[model samples]
Target chain A: VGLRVVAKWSSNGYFYSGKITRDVKYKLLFDDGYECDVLGKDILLCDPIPLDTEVTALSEDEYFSAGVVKGHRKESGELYYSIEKEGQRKWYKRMAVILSLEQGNRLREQYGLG
Target chain B: AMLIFVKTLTGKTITLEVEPSDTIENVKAKIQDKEGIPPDQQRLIFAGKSLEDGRTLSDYNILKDSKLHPLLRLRG
Candidate 1:
């Protein structure tokens, strides 16, 4: 609906803001220096905020707190995340459960962690 | 056949010698043999797509040196 879909890399710390074109399958052929690839489910989808808009996304690098919402456990309604810290992947509780688009937008506005 | 580096959630990796002629189920069997994860609990993700059961590795064009993630499903 806008210029491009902005996403945050789950494993590595990088922001991917690019035009995602899809067919029967996703295709990525870049003419620019912006290295792109088919995104994993580990991405954080954020609102369309400008790059120079002085917004910031959340980070594990910032405070041993890298949490990517991977999926939800339908039974309990709690979210599951692939957390990376202490030099490895882990499963821990206490992660934020963003239940709605409004909550996600609030997170985008609060930390811009996409 | 080529080297397929399979990474785990804990950053540990295991190398799987695979061929495009190999089936995804075959790959999962190898993973279960090596990682002791069992076929039913193993979920492999490559190139952002979960490898489909019964498909050939060549179907996805997974080239040599391509890394795959063997996600272990820990039943809660």
Candidate 2:
């Protein structure tokens, strides 16, 4: 298949850039040289968001924190972004991260957590 | 050719690529390779029916992007 894409590594819940090597079984060869089979749910056919874009990312603890876009992936037609904050980076669903402080505040308000 | 999601009780999910000809046992082995859970210890359920080891995905009419629920049998 040889399609450049980003896929989630189930082990750490992080999405990494890769290329689809086998279409039938959906085998992926990561940029880091790791190869594995992935399902469509975890594979995104998109380029990474340009690095260093300021954004808010959802952390493992279920809270949005300020971060910068460091990576990205697309899956099932939706985009996901990797946000870097405090020297750490993690991938989050597009819905979980926002590009504007106002958007973040609006989401927090809707959930009554602001 | 299809991709399926195997969601565990722990809230973690693993995605797998499968063909309609793949057997349930084969799917289990893939899970084993990915998660280190023995195939015998994995039980997959889709569309409210428990998948039998010998049955192919086509037998269950599993479509593309289907989500399968995996119940891990605790080893005593």
Candidate 3:
């Protein structure tokens, strides 16, 4: 496993930076010194940018509840929303269409997050 | 004293009496004791944010009639 700078949601409900282990399979390691949990090979990185492309860290509550913007899709000018559930990695599409962020806030409220 | 009602993902509701200083982790342990869901896999959401294990209910200003929802995370 190689050392790579990464970021992830912590138990305290915020994103924090750390040096995670980038395994040969691209699975992530949480510095736990053990291969437990579905963190590796599935999380996004901030440094040593992927393919030397431009990227930004996702911070919306959606990134915590439903999905995270890991990378951008050059072909469609959309973003890759990565969500992991039960060990399955899913990619969702968000369009360049216009909408209100309050809708997302409303979703957070619907889930009793507010 | 505050009485909090926790709604599980499967729609199971459990009521527990709590103190101002009771940590969310402590409440999660109680849930583990009464429910099959473990504390680590439990994500408790309230007031539009997931409650941290280290934060006390009082810290979040949780009070009577507060509805706390627990979403169980299961990984294969």
Candidate 4:
């Protein structure tokens, strides 16, 4: 697997492309630039994604999701997502993501990080 | 009395006898009357563009002898 995993603590978010790890902390920020912290554990599993998987966000909205609980993930660090239900803070896994390594690198390259 | 052609939104072609005092909405109501369509659901058309409820056909340079050919379409 010609892929690299680089984890760091940054204010940036999860989006773009690639396989995602689970229970990995994520804080989804909203449109007006308001940030809210929720453990990826707060989300639910709705599907599965594979290693080296290039899964896109569920919809244009999730890729651009800014809400606390957006949608769901199904299995494994897979289709990572949030839910609209209560009492469902299951530590389920489904390829979690919030700006994977390759994607961050892409943004870095595209915008020339200082 | 000037005869004007009105393109309506209810799938009907309509003609109307208009006076200087008639506004576009007035004409639309007349068209609705002739076509038996509800006012809220109907739209009025003129010259290649749609007309606004706030203005009269006279504001759009509709002539006294000009023909107002009404073509109708349906809407939500």
Question: CA shift at A69, candidate 1, in angstroms?
Answer: 35
Q: Candidate 3's residue-wise lDDT over B1-76, tens digit each?
A: 5544455564333445677688989888878886767888888776466678779877876543322222222122
List the candidate 4 regions with Cα displacement exceeding 4 Å: A1-114, B8-11, B64-76
* Candidate closest to the true structure, highest lDDT: 2
DockQ of each two-chain model: 0.03, 0.02, 0.03, 0.01
What TM-score does chain B alone reach in each candidate, compared with the true chain B?
0.77, 0.78, 0.75, 0.66
The weakest ten consecutive residues by lDDT in model 4 chain B span B66-75
Could you give the candidate ranking by TM-score, starting with the highest?
2, 1, 3, 4
Q: Which stretches of candidate 2 lie over 4 Å from their true place?
A: A1-114, B64-76
Q: Note each model's CA RMSD in angstroms.
A: 16.8, 15.2, 15.4, 22.4
Which scores greater on TM-score, model 1 or model 2? 2
Give the alpha-carbon lDDT of every model: 0.43, 0.59, 0.41, 0.39
| Of candidates 3 and 1, the better by DockQ | 1
- For residues A1-114, write the lDDT of model 3, one tens digit per residue: 444433332221222223444444344433322232333323344432233221222223222222323444434633344433334445533311111133222323222111
Docking class of 4: incorrect
Lowest-lDDT window of 10 residues in candidate 1 chain A? A55-64
Ranking the candidates on lDDT from highest down gives: 2, 1, 3, 4
Residue lDDT tens for model 4, A13-105 = 333222123222544332212333444332222222223332222222112111223445455533445532233322222222333334444
| Candidate 2 positional error at A23, Å | 37
